[PDB]
Nucleic acid binder design. Sequence first.
DNA 1: CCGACGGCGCATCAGC
DNA 2: GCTGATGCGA
DNA 3: GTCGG
Length: 326
Amino acid sequence: TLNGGITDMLTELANFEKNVSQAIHKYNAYRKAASVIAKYPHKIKSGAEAKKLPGVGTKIAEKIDEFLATGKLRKLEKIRQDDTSSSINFLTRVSGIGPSAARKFVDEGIKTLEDLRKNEDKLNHHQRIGLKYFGDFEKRIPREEMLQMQDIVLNEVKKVDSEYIATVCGSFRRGAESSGDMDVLLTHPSFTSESTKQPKLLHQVVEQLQKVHFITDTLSKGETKFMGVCQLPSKNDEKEYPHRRIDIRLIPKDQYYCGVLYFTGSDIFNKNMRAHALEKGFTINEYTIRPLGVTGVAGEPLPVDSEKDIFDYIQWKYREPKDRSE
DNA sequence: CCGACGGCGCATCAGC
DNA sequence: GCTGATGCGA
DNA sequence: GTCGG
Ligand SMILES: Nc1ccn([C@H]2C[C@H](O)[C@@H](COP(=O)(O)C(F)(F)P(=O)(O)OP(=O)(O)O)O2)c(=O)n1
Ligand SMILES: [Cl-]
Ligand SMILES: [Cl-]
Ligand SMILES: [Cl-]
Ligand SMILES: [Cl-]
Ligand SMILES: [Mg+2]
Ligand SMILES: [Mg+2]
Ligand code: NA
Ligand code: NA
């Protein structure tokens, strides 16, 4: 909140470039600048001072000076008035509707929540669910509720097979007071980078959670990733809790550390760390950290026994989860 | 100046 | 049916 | 839009 005005402006500019301009790199550039400014420990006084931060160039510097002076950004004033842009922006807020589909719908005259509801037939499954719980998905999740959800998931997973280990990551693991959703990393000894000694490992868990009515809907479901909806049980006379998005990722047990690092985030932190890895001659994904030969092709997986091991390979001091919220 | 910018899972599609 | 490309998402 | 070579 120290430089809230400027970061909000940058984030809005970022969303515009992504949803309307479909210029993903401009999107990341803005988000990075927004992130770097967000942790700057001083109340920014000028674009010049801001340009000293990495990721902030001449363009954002000018925009910051404009914002600091007037208290707004004309470029944004306009974007906010353009009915097409605003419509595209809105629709992309429905889970399942990206920049392409949004532009396509608007070109069909479908540009509001009301239009989407009467044209439900024109939506694929994911979009149908995103629209159904549109309101709820906008709501944040108090950490207290996250704790209750964790308890339900861990206990139900334990019931399926005591050998399962379920770890809630995402912003929760980073210590956030509230989260946009629940992200669950799941492991089981019967599934490693060496073999899949038992099939349906993820299925069984998803099934158990549906059986006790915690999981209510499914957006997508594969062998290692589940994307759906859940809801905490409410007491008698108590109004129901909002429905929530839940992601579950089954990762090879022998690759837990690269897995938990990836799933802990943040997303911008992962980008920056993976970008730093490249500059150091390494490539990192949710399974391994591999070296890059002179040729450029990824080499063999390096031995990892802790999140810190990954940080060492790239010559970075270890950072606790609470300090990776970029 | 200009090429890189993180990496991948699932759903859906076109082309065979 | 397969692969590969795309959209959308983590 | 920003960066580094
Ligand atoms: N583009 C991305 C997106 C995600 N992630 C990893 C790193 C992320 O931490 C993790 C979770 O994705 P999430 O989509 O639940 C998230 F990011 F919003 P979270 O941090 O959990 O914040 P919230 O509370 O609001 O959910 O996936 C990533 O690596 N790249
Ligand atoms: Cl771009
Ligand atoms: Cl503004
Ligand atoms: Cl690992
Ligand atoms: Cl790999
Ligand atoms: Mg999350
Ligand atoms: Mg998530
Ligand atoms: Na800079
Ligand atoms: Na969307």
